[PDB]
Amino acid sequence: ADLYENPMGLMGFEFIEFASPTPGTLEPIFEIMGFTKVATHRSKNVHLYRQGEINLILNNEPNSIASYFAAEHGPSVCGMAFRVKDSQKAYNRALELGAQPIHIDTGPMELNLPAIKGIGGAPLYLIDRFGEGSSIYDIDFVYLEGVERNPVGAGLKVIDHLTHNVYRGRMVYWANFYEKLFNFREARYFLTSKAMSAPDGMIRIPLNEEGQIEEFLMQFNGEGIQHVAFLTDDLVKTWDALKKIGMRFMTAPPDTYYEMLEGRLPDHGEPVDQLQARGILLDGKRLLLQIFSETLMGPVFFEFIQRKGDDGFGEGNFKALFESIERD
Amino acid sequence: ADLYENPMGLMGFEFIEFASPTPGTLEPIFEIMGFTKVATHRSKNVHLYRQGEINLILNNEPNSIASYFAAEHGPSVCGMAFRVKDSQKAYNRALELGAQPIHIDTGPMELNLPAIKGIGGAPLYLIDRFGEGSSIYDIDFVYLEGVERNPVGAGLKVIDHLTHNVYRGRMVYWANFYEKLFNFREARYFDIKGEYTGLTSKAMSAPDGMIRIPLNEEAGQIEEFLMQFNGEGIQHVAFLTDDLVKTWDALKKIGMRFMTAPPDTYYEMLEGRLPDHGEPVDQLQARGILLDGSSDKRLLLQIFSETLMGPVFFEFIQRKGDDGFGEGNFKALFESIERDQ
Amino acid sequence: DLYENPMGLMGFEFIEFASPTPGTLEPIFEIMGFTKVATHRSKNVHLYRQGEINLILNNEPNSIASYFAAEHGPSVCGMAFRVKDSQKAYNRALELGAQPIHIDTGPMELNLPAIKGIGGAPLYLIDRFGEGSSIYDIDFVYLEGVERNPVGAGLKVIDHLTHNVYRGRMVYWANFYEKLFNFREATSKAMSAPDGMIRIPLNEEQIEEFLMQFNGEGIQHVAFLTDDLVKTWDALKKIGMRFMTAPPDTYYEMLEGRLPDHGEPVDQLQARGILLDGSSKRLLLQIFSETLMGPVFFEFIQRKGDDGFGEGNFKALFES
């Protein structure tokens, strides 16, 4: 696959799964982020929200793996599916390499989803059914009558990355996990972090241990996914699209963050006034634009990124943001 | 029992279970702590070590829940059992209240021991078969021929407490876990200036007044344990003795490794810290035994081992009216060291 | 130039050769189409050139190179990477745990930084290159008259060089190049540098017999690109180039079958023992010399879309 040795035939993110011990707390979060309910499971209280190529699964099955996850962690990403070319080739290798299976209970005439124990114990699914017509959603879900099958929403296209926050000294443990099992490699350049990149060139999972990280671990009651980043081709248009449907972003940087923009990023070319009108951040000629939601699902938040050459994660915005509240 | 409403019918610790990813590492520790191997499982490679009313299970079965725990955490307490009046009722009650079952594979003609997922994933077993002739050891274990089945060892009598280290914020989680399922309650302890000691340590105590499970959270001793243990779990196991000086001598004879004794600055301040405590100071100083309490003379004697199973260490305690855990010794020891610096 | 390049690699700069026995590397460069074009200012080392390929014969006694050749015979004793800035690259490699190799340097010559590489050969990190600015313009003296930029038999660049390693070390050296230079893995592992130019396949088992003869890990073969193998072949054969003995004619009967269309003059390949690989379109032409520097041999390759190394030629040759 695309990048390097993909002995697991990873083909990108398939879905991410959410659940909440409190009803009606996840549905409005999906809507303000431009996602559309498009299908409901054939027999479980489980729902599919879509935007672009992003599949968001809302799991409200009671007495389930996901509800036990939610009861301990609160509103959360409790599951994460990887696309693979052959789910048995990968499920059996992962167990041979020592992965722990998690049994997801499956109803009659429904698909058996193979899953292993992942970050915080959340299932990591290996799904080899995909595409319109043959995907797991066509088989086990029922689409709403006459609803647009592939909503575009506010222009989020893919999951660009999601992070894991991990306790002090666990990052080598979770780096090993993704290396040994999926042939992830840390990309490496040049707060402590390891950008784990998958051989498919689509899955990126950065790992953080520490403030900001320690507060997540306490509020989340464990390791887990701290933020999911959605890619868009035009963050500025996406920004306006999201704000008109109720999106709440991190409060904008002080204006002095934009005076330095030409200083720290000569000839970036971006309309400075449009980014400042919306508090959009910038890092990079390889460039990227990004902006964050507030914490919406406990301490879990969301990122919206547009890449203009830069393949990083906006790390330079810590120095930029701090040294802007230094002159303001 | 006694203290609180006891809806699970708790009646004290039943056993704690140990596993290790490396062989011959738990066995020499049980021996130097005065435990005797009394029985071996009818079919599994699991062994019963005994001293007084203390039951320790060494679980050497491979590819087991216990073996995975020890592979992830090192040599460790990999489980614990509570005596309950009715295991079927308590267990059902746990599940209804949101506990998660842990399936422990039981073989032909062995007992189905129910258990729920506990700290670090370790099984918490709920056992209603106990006492001589009726115990799970009598049913599922074979006592070594000859060997005395009620050894006194070095005089350790009962498990007094198992204090856990948990990640920051998880002390509220586990306190509520134990409150909701079992009606454990915190006992708040107060130091020498009358100030609450439980900011980062909840002395969760079962309604039977026997089970004590202190929950600790923190660049100090707790986070070092969490790293070295690779998770949350029991940091030390405290055994009660009726005479700690006598127990100490028995332990030293068979090779116990104790923590280095406090500087004798510690034993001078003893009359000032605990006026008219009445203990034979020279005896305690010779052995590095610690003394805490308040003088109504309510006192306790305690000594700790070195770390013996990874970061897990052991405590030997004699209670003489004090219901606490020796938290007065932190300040006492620090001042001893500053009078020695 | 094709993914993240933290070390600023810009392709092979040169490769270094040494021999414990004089007069034994000099003929092998000439018959491969290389020509002495410069001699060091102060050391018995000589620059042979063809296209953009820079070959260094280091004869200097009591040296880094001499000891390496003494333990491993005639050999590639060293390898240089072009880098944007070599102080940045060297410092970072040390930061990431590489070990330095002292290359002794004399008055008024260049301090060439290098780290420990395969078989302990120095991996130089060179940031001086191009017309009038290269290390050769500085540390070498060109022969008067004879052109500085020979075209030779049309060999253009080092396409790749493969390491042979002990069993199990293939993941060590893969992580060596991954961690240090962000190579990625595009029985053997083909490591590709982010510059799109440096390719270093690693082999562990043919390979055992190299390790024995070489007395350790090292560069098994060096592959040279050309724009036409047939014309390069004629050019090489005219100066005494020694190739592998040609394959069996059946190899060329299975040819059209294994490669539908392909579009290659089957006749001129066989007149020369040239081999073929690809899909059938991507393709590549290749030919190998005999073992010329101990167990070290050389490959002459022409690419026709195929990013591969002709691995299918194993089955092809042994289904013959």
Added chain:
Amino acid sequence: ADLYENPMGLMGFEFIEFASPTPGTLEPIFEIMGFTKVATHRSKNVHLYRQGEINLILNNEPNSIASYFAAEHGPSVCGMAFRVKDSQKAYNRALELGAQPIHIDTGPMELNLPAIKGIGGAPLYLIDRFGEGSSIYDIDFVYLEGVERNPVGAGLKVIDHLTHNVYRGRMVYWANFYEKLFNFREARYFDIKGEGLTSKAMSAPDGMIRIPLNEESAGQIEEFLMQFNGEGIQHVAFLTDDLVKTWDALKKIGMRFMTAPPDTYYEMLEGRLPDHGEPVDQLQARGILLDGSDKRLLLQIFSETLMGPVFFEFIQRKGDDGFGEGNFKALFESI
């Protein structure tokens, strides 16, 4: 009592050195093997563990030769030291013969330690300072206050031998290395039918240093070389005056031995070694192995692997000067 010409003035092993890229991985192994930490370097994070006349050095010094070596090879013997009469003479001779210097960084007011490149890159030290008061430990280490400096531990006395696993065809290289520099000689060969180990016992001219070289032929030597990321010391054998009592002492403190042979191994002992005289019941209960052939005997037992693929041997010699090579055929027949 040298055996033949001793041009380097060898006088026995001095220390072996260990390093690991993971903290706390070497210390418990030393403890379960009966070693006691008796001293710490004057300035570096390096410690001296001792049992009988065995000096083991735990080298935790970062950014050092040891740490680079452990980085490549894992927990390991990163260094070996020979006692010599005159370390300046030996070292100069080694260099003149083509040995390669290894520079070990020496702090102010500490000893310059001479070392040449040895097995797998590990320094081979030449140490001419030994004896209570005159040792390199007395000079550059600080003994714990009070502690006894010559602990007997579980009764291990000296390094009997240690091996090198080398790649195929490298045995000739490493035989030559020890022959050319130190006049080690192969003095004894035990025949082993191909039922893949080939071995070469190199004996130094002092009669004390013995280094068997092992290469392969998919087995135990290649599994080491893969796990170790190269050639290196495979096991260290410690001599004891009574393996049974040493065994008891080692089991008490956590030693992890190889699981005993099947009982057929002990039924075949009289057949294999008629009238050997050893208490078979005591050996079988402990899984102790017996070999030999004039009742030349040897008792040995091995640990499990304890630092990556390095393991340890505990051996009581009763006339047999071999290495227990008879135990391969005998365990083959046992199972």
